Design a protein around this ligand. Sequence first.
Ligand code: 6AN
Ligand code: 6AN
Ligand code: CA
Ligand code: CA
Ligand code: ZN
Ligand code: ZN
Lengths: 96, 96
Amino acid sequence: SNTQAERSIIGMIDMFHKYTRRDDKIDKPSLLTMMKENFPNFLSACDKKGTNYLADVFEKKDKNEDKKIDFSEFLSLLGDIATDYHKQSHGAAPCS
Amino acid sequence: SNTQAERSIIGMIDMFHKYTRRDDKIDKPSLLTMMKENFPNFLSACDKKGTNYLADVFEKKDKNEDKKIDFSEFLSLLGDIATDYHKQSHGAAPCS
Ligand SMILES: O=S(=O)(O)c1ccc2cc(N=C3C=CCC=C3)ccc2c1
Ligand SMILES: O=S(=O)(O)c1ccc2cc(N=C3C=CCC=C3)ccc2c1
Ligand SMILES: [Ca+2]
Ligand SMILES: [Ca+2]
Ligand SMILES: [Zn+2]
Ligand SMILES: [Zn+2]
């Protein structure tokens, strides 16, 4: 009875919870695994452009420098991926 | 060949573009239609709790007060919906 958009939001929370530790936050090796497992085509587009997105993603998104990615910082990471796909839809190259 | 997570991000951009005007932004009646069409179960949970989420969503999310919701403000709206589902998964009531 949920719509495609509601299922996508619910699945986003469930995806976060595949990778969290017991403090409900994602550490660095688990964040890189999450990216490889869930955004491999995005990552491959970046590599084609000469960008290794995994070299700096944790440092860029761990905004409070606690060495963990909490749910708010995870939303910001999904917002960056979504913003790259929105620029592509307007004719930008991937991973711009 | 895209994963479920990549399909969800792509579908999010496509959903934004169902509702934009020619300036790539969503006006107020189209934002309310988008919510009714895409998040009806979320909305129904809010109504059960006595909250009419559509009364104030535009005013809360139009952060630069230009009377349009641009892609950045649309991501913030999806982040609020996702944060409510993340609190529910931790045992909060819906639409808290
Ligand atoms: O046709 S599919 O490629 O299988 C597809 C997948 C997910 C979608 C998410 C959509 N909406 C979202 C809402 C909130 C967060 C992410 C996507 C809309 C359409 C979608 C379509
Ligand atoms: O089994 S389903 O209910 O049909 C489903 C639907 C969408 C998902 C999105 C997922 N990941 C997302 C990534 C980015 C933005 C939104 C969701 C993960 C699992 C999902 C599962
Ligand atoms: Ca952090
Ligand atoms: Ca605005
Ligand atoms: Zn959690
Ligand atoms: Zn656009």
